[PDB]
Amino acid sequence: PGTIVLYAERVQDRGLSAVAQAESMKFKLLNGLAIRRAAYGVVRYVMESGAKGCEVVVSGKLRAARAKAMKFADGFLIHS
Amino acid sequence: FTPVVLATPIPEEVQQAQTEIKLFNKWSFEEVEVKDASLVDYVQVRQPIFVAHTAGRYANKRFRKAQCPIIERLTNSLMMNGRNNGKKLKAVRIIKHTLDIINVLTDQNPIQVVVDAITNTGPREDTTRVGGGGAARRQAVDVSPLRRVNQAIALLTIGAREAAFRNIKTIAETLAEELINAAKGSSTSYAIKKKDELERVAKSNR
Amino acid sequence: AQHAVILDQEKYDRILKEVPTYRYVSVSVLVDRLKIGGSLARIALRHLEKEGIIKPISKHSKQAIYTRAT
Amino acid sequence: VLKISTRKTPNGEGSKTWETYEMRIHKRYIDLEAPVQIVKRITQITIEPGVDVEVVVASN
Amino acid sequence: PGVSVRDVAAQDFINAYASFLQRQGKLEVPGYVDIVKTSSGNEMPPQDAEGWFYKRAASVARHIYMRKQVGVGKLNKLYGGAKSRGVRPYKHIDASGSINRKVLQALEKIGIVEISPKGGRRISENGQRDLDRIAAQTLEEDE
Amino acid sequence: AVPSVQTFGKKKSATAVAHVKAGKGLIKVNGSPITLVEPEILRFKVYEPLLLVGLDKFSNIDIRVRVTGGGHVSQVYAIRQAIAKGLVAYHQKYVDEQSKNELKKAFTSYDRTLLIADSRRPEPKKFGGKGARSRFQKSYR
Amino acid sequence: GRVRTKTVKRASKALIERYYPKLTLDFQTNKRLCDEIATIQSKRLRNKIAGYTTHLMKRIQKGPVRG
Amino acid sequence: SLVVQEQGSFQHILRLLNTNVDGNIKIVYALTTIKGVGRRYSNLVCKKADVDLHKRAGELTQEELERIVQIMQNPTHYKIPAWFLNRQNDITDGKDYHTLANNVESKLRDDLERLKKIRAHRGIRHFWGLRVRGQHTKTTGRRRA
Amino acid sequence: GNEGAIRDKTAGRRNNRSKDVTDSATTKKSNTRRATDRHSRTGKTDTKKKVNQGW
Amino acid sequence: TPVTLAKVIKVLGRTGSRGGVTQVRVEFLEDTSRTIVRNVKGPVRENDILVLMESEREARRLR
RNA sequence: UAAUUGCGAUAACGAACGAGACCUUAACCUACUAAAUAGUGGUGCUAGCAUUUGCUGGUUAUCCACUUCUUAGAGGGACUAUCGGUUUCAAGCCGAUGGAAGUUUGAGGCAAUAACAGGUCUGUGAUGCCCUUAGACGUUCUGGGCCGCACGCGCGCUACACUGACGGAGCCAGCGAGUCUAACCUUGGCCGAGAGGUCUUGGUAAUCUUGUGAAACUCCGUCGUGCUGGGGAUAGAGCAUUGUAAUUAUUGCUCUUCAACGAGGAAUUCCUAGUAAGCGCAAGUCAUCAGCUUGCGUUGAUUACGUCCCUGCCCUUUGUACACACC
Ligand SMILES: [Mg+2]
Ligand SMILES: [Mg+2]
Ligand SMILES: [Mg+2]
Ligand SMILES: [Mg+2]
Ligand SMILES: [Mg+2]
Ligand SMILES: [Mg+2]
Ligand SMILES: [Mg+2]
Ligand SMILES: [Mg+2]
Ligand SMILES: [Mg+2]
Ligand SMILES: [Mg+2]
Ligand SMILES: [Mg+2]
Ligand SMILES: [Mg+2]
Ligand SMILES: [Mg+2]
Ligand SMILES: [Mg+2]
Ligand SMILES: [Mg+2]
Ligand SMILES: [Mg+2]
Ligand SMILES: [Mg+2]
Ligand SMILES: [Mg+2]
Ligand SMILES: [Mg+2]
Ligand SMILES: [Mg+2]
Ligand SMILES: [Mg+2]
Ligand SMILES: [Mg+2]
Ligand SMILES: [Mg+2]
Ligand SMILES: [Mg+2]
Ligand SMILES: [Mg+2]
Ligand SMILES: [Mg+2]
Ligand SMILES: [Mg+2]
Ligand SMILES: [Mg+2]
Ligand SMILES: [Mg+2]
Ligand SMILES: [Mg+2]
Ligand SMILES: [Mg+2]
Ligand SMILES: [Mg+2]
Ligand SMILES: [Mg+2]
């Protein structure tokens, strides 16, 4: 007891936070949104938080039996 | 030769031949000449060497292989057939012995004899499997000097090894037998045979 | 089995009167002269050097080498 | 250097590709002759996340 | 001039010392010699038959002269080589600790080596003495 | 303190250090004369520098060398390199330049790397073969 | 195969364009120049650049070069 | 060693332990063509017999051969260790034998029979002409019987 | 039991050795199905409305 | 027997389906001022010396 | 060009993802900052041999100084540099010299867009739906089984010996890893033919195991071409180790038994320099078991430095009634 201590700490803009933006999609879809609305919104907001670029992939299955994926990018990224 | 010595001392013949002439295990590099025009440039001899071992970078360029001292090329080609791959100390010693042996028979710088069996075994012309349509004839070709040296060494050591296999005669002895029979070409050597035949067919198909 | 494992007195004398002209003598040469296998032929190598003919010009296991006396 | 060398696949199919991770461990020591005051001062501070600082004593 | 053994090549030395320890007659030869192998990693026993314990004695001694201290383990590891596990790959294997340990105890009783602190067996000063001596002797045959 | 340099030699992973000081002419390796050495066939390889440059040369100097690493041939090349490098390092601080450069000349000329270290080294094996380039074996079906 | 990527050749172009006096068929100094005079992030890439701009100079000296 | 001589002395081929033994082989190995005398056994027996192993089967006195046999079939008496022996701890009288020659065949018979007679898996396995030391039998030995 | 197993002829090696070997021993892979891999069996199909609602 | 020596003066290129053959113009030695084109079998450079086994006859293509 | 890498041609100009850059590791720093957990020289304490100085050791501190070697921070270094050939005198390519280094410096890490009904629901307390749910398809306990053997296929290990086996003797690596609320890495001493046993011991580690004295290899012997002393399958008897348990034999040792295999048809794999091949080691797995893997160093070649003949693949042009796209 007392040899361990927790503090919270707001994060300087969730906008450049992969983890935050993923959790945000999770919530958008889970909260019964649209697909492109959710994604394009996350993206437009990440961009708006002044990012160099960003990309959101949704893979799996929506409403139709067969699985599909979708890339939603804007701005600029490097890959290698 | 003027001897000299210091603390830990250096043996007689050692001092002697060392500082004077720059010769082999202990054989002359001076004299020793390539009795076939061409082949010179592709048989080394001078710069002279003590033993045929060298951390040689003779591969990284197309032709520099040529520049490697001949005797060491021979010993190199000794150290194959799987079991023996690597094992240059083995090979080198086999050569020292071989040269002693060859020397015993008929004198000559034995390195000169080697030089001769090498000159005397490269095929002046050969053949390749040209198409010409399914039933492939054979177009006579005149073969490079480099290929001639290469193939000479290959042949000599192969025949020497194949001979030596499964009998009491030891590698150096049969290598010296092939070398000798070949140096002044005598159709009792596997090498000379194979050259003569390559050129027989190469004539036969021009 | 096919022979050369003993000494048959005639063989000994044979060894003494046959070993000149042998510019090369070794384990192998002695066998090749239709006699002594590499056991007792090694002994022959040690014992022609007892005194005479063979002049030691090389050294070791596997390879030995000698020349006619002078 | 701690290597861990694993198949990439979670199963078995595919050409057998191998992959290898490392954690690099860097260690250092500085020996210092001082009194209690300066050691305690200097070592309560200089604190740093990720750096494991250990202070011993003695000559045995 | 002055002398050590380091001034004398392995073989002719160790054979010089073999022939010596032999001659001498003082030694200790366990008795299981001749009926024994030298390592589980071996096929046949030694060919020197009468002797070879002198050969290893010499070898061991010179090995210990040429360094601080050495134990039975290090010698087993040294004197050991490849064992054919027949049809399954070769692996190095240690040699017998009896042969060695007994050899040490022998040379020690003969005062040519001594239980060292630190661990193991250090060459004796009288070992230094006698070894440098026959070393010298071996260069003296060569004169 | 007498005049003295240190040098080294390197083939594969073997490394051979030379201490080359003013002496009455010893040439020892680890702790034995340079006459022992064995490898043996290769023995001349280590004599090689001395004879290339005249046996005298070592009379104002004591030479000692110690090799660790590599293996048998590996160590021979390292020690010889260390010795020739040594001799030259010594003529560079104590004798005059022209002498040193005459020695670099006779080594560098004939050579076997004596002054310069061979850069060849192990290449790492990569999964899918017992070697670096060697790939395993396939049957198709 | 030793052929220089765009970024390298592009940079030689621009540099020679705007700093031809200073620069001089010597890599060694053109190098140092590049340090003092432009901002690169790897030694390697900077060298590559200098060496090529050095080449380009070295051949401008004997008649013009397109681009 | 030495250039030797002798006369009619040595007779090629000689017969011990109900078998035959070639002359002109290095004796230690001659003894081997008998059943139950691996190279080691032979070596130690010869050393115990006080014989010059440098000899062929060739030479050797009759006497010498006699001693050789005596020791071969009474190892424990002429101080041979017993861990050196192919049949220690019988399984009935519990003595230690080094079973030799035409008798090792019998002893194999005996043991295999004991296993079969007692119905033990090893026995059944033998009777079936299969491998008994537990090796996989899918792939190996198909040339077989 | 074990008495059974040794006493049972129609057992052991000789007996097998003397029997012919079946041909399905020396068979081949089988394969069964592959040029149907792209051809869906479900017989179901999706539909542009459901897909457009989803995606 | 009549040997004929020729010096490689120009390397033309590789022929043969496999492509291990090399076409070369050679100036023979015992009397220059005359050139012939032969086909090699080994690796070849400018100034090597071929032993034309037969002195007059020359090729071109190779499949 | 390794590269949509560039030059050049040019209704295009100028750019971005990817390649490149970047990062890691291997190479070079008598320049920098240092070190009893790395080492060198001097000095003391001291052994041996010569004796005329000398030569070779002992001594985790008896002190002094150093940083060449070792360690790892910071820098520096290379840019295919200089010169010359060749090329549309372009990007480039080649040779020579210099150089630690000039094959993308060697080797890796990262790696766009798109595709596949590739494999994985048996890695997951990731998961839809179906099934099952107390005579369980939950779970645990005892015992067996995945190892079963006429035989087809793949990866492998060991061999056919004399560039060798055996036996003395010489004797040299690099990458690793190790015990707290525990029994891990183990030196040394004894006992034991061996395997192993036993008493102590150092180490939570650049400190101890450990210079991991590894194996191929080197040297002096034995054997002598004989299925031989090559080879060591199969099998018998005995001894020990892990484990609650060893039978269908975990593994280790000793004696004995001594097979096929005399270089392997049609076919077919892999490979360009410290590479190939030979050789061992450490790590993973692990109570015990490596003939496997992943890395590591040791010994260290022959042959190309080319092409499109075989095969495979990308690219143009071309045809299409295909577009769920030749399944
Ligand atoms: Mg990029
Ligand atoms: Mg060893
Ligand atoms: Mg050994
Ligand atoms: Mg490797
Ligand atoms: Mg037997
Ligand atoms: Mg590419
Ligand atoms: Mg004095
Ligand atoms: Mg004095
Ligand atoms: Mg430093
Ligand atoms: Mg150069
Ligand atoms: Mg790099
Ligand atoms: Mg899964
Ligand atoms: Mg489920
Ligand atoms: Mg799992
Ligand atoms: Mg998960
Ligand atoms: Mg279930
Ligand atoms: Mg299974
Ligand atoms: Mg299969
Ligand atoms: Mg596989
Ligand atoms: Mg050996
Ligand atoms: Mg006991
Ligand atoms: Mg403790
Ligand atoms: Mg180490
Ligand atoms: Mg046979
Ligand atoms: Mg054997
Ligand atoms: Mg069991
Ligand atoms: Mg079973
Ligand atoms: Mg046999
Ligand atoms: Mg073969
Ligand atoms: Mg198991
Ligand atoms: Mg393991
Ligand atoms: Mg496995
Ligand atoms: Mg049409």
Swiss-Prot record, chain C:
Keyword vocabulary terms for this entry: Cytoplasm, Methylation, Ribonucleoprotein, Ribosomal protein
GO cellular component: cytosol; cytosolic small ribosomal subunit
GO biological process: cytoplasmic translation
Principal cellular location given in the protein's record: cytoplasm
UniProt GO MF annotations: structural constituent of ribosome
Subcellular localization, as worded in the UniProt entry: Cytoplasm
Protein family: Belongs to the eukaryotic ribosomal protein eS25 family.
Annotated function: Component of the ribosome, a large ribonucleoprotein complex responsible for the synthesis of proteins in the cell. The small ribosomal subunit (SSU) binds messenger RNAs (mRNAs) and translates the encoded message by selecting cognate aminoacyl-transfer RNA (tRNA) molecules. The large subunit (LSU) contains the ribosomal catalytic site termed the peptidyl transferase center (PTC), which catalyzes the formation of peptide bonds, thereby polymerizing the amino acids delivered by tRNAs into a polypeptide chain.
Assembly and interaction partners: Component of the small ribosomal subunit (SSU). Mature yeast ribosomes consist of a small (40S) and a large (60S) subunit. The 40S small subunit contains 1 molecule of ribosomal RNA (18S rRNA) and 33 different proteins (encoded by 57 genes). The large 60S subunit contains 3 rRNA molecules (25S, 5.8S and 5S rRNA) and 46 different proteins (encoded by 81 genes).
Protein name: Small ribosomal subunit protein eS25A
Organism of derivation: Saccharomyces cerevisiae (strain ATCC 204508 / S288c) (Baker's yeast)
Gene designation: RPS25A
Residues of the full protein shown: 36 to 105 of 108
Swiss-Prot record, chain E:
Organism, as annotated: Saccharomyces cerevisiae (strain ATCC 204508 / S288c)
Family: Belongs to the eukaryotic ribosomal protein eS19 family.
Pfam families documented for this protein: Ribosomal_S19e
Primary localisation category: cytoplasm
UniProt KW keywords: Cytoplasm, Ribonucleoprotein, Ribosomal protein, Ribosome biogenesis
Physiological role: Component of the ribosome, a large ribonucleoprotein complex responsible for the synthesis of proteins in the cell. The small ribosomal subunit (SSU) binds messenger RNAs (mRNAs) and translates the encoded message by selecting cognate aminoacyl-transfer RNA (tRNA) molecules. The large subunit (LSU) contains the ribosomal catalytic site termed the peptidyl transferase center (PTC), which catalyzes the formation of peptide bonds, thereby polymerizing the amino acids delivered by tRNAs into a polypeptide chain.
GO biological process, one term: ribosomal small subunit biogenesis
Gene: RPS19A
Protein name: Small ribosomal subunit protein eS19A
Effect noted on mutating R101E: Decreases mature 18S rRNA, protein binds 20S pre-RNA complex poorly. Lethal in double RPS19A/RPS19B mutant
Subcellular location(s) of the protein: Cytoplasm
From Swiss-Prot, chain H:
Entry-linked HAMAP family: Ribosomal_uS13 (MF_01315)
Miscellaneous comment as given in the Swiss-Prot or TrEMBL entry: Present with 48100 molecules/cell in log phase SD medium. There are 2 genes for uS13 in yeast.
Top-level taxon: Eukaryota
Pfam families recorded: Ribosomal_S13
GO cellular component: cytoplasm; cytosol; cytosolic small ribosomal subunit; mitochondrion; small ribosomal subunit
Encoding gene per record: RPS18A
Protein name as it appears in the record: Small ribosomal subunit protein uS13A
Crosslink feature (Glycyl lysine isopeptide (Lys-Gly) (interchain with G-Cter in ubiquitin)) location: K35, K48, K79, K95
Record's function text: Component of the ribosome, a large ribonucleoprotein complex responsible for the synthesis of proteins in the cell. The small ribosomal subunit (SSU) binds messenger RNAs (mRNAs) and translates the encoded message by selecting cognate aminoacyl-transfer RNA (tRNA) molecules. The large subunit (LSU) contains the ribosomal catalytic site termed the peptidyl transferase center (PTC), which catalyzes the formation of peptide bonds, thereby polymerizing the amino acids delivered by tRNAs into a polypeptide chain.
GO biological process: cytoplasmic translation; endonucleolytic cleavage in ITS1 to separate SSU-rRNA from 5.8S rRNA and LSU-rRNA from tricistronic rRNA transcript (SSU-rRNA, 5.8S rRNA, LSU-rRNA); ribosomal subunit export from nucleus
UniProt KW Metal-binding keyword: no
Natural source organism: Saccharomyces cerevisiae (strain ATCC 204508 / S288c) (Baker's yeast)
Post-translational modification: N-terminally acetylated by acetyltransferase NatA.
Family (UniProt): Belongs to the universal ribosomal protein uS13 family.
List of residues that carry N6-methyllysine: K47
Locations listed in the record: Cytoplasm
Post-translational modification N-acetylserine, affected residues: S1
SUPFAM superfamilies tied to this protein: S13-like H2TH domain (SSF46946)
Swiss-Prot record, chain I:
Highest taxon of source: Eukaryota
Residues where Phosphoserine is found: S18
Record localization: Cytoplasm; Nucleus; Cytoplasm, Perinuclear region
Residue ranges, compositional bias (Basic and acidic residues): 5-22, 34-49
PTM remark: Phosphorylation by TORC1 upon nutrient replenishment inhibits STM1 and causes its release from dormant ribosomes.
General function of this protein: Ribosome preservation factor that protect a small pool of nontranslating, vacant ribosomes in cells under nutrient starvation conditions. Under nutrient-limiting conditions, cells reduce ribosome biogenesis and degrade ribosomes via autophagy (ribophagy) or proteasomal degradation. To avoid excessive degradation during starvation, STM1 binds to and protects 80S ribosomes from proteasomal degradation. Under nutrient-sufficient conditions, TORC1 phosphorylates and inhibits STM1 to prevent formation of dormant 80S ribosomes.
Similarity remark: Belongs to the SERBP1-HABP4 family.
Protein name according to UniProt: Suppressor protein STM1
Source organism per UniProt: Saccharomyces cerevisiae (strain ATCC 204508 / S288c)
Section covered of the full-length record: 56 to 110 of 273
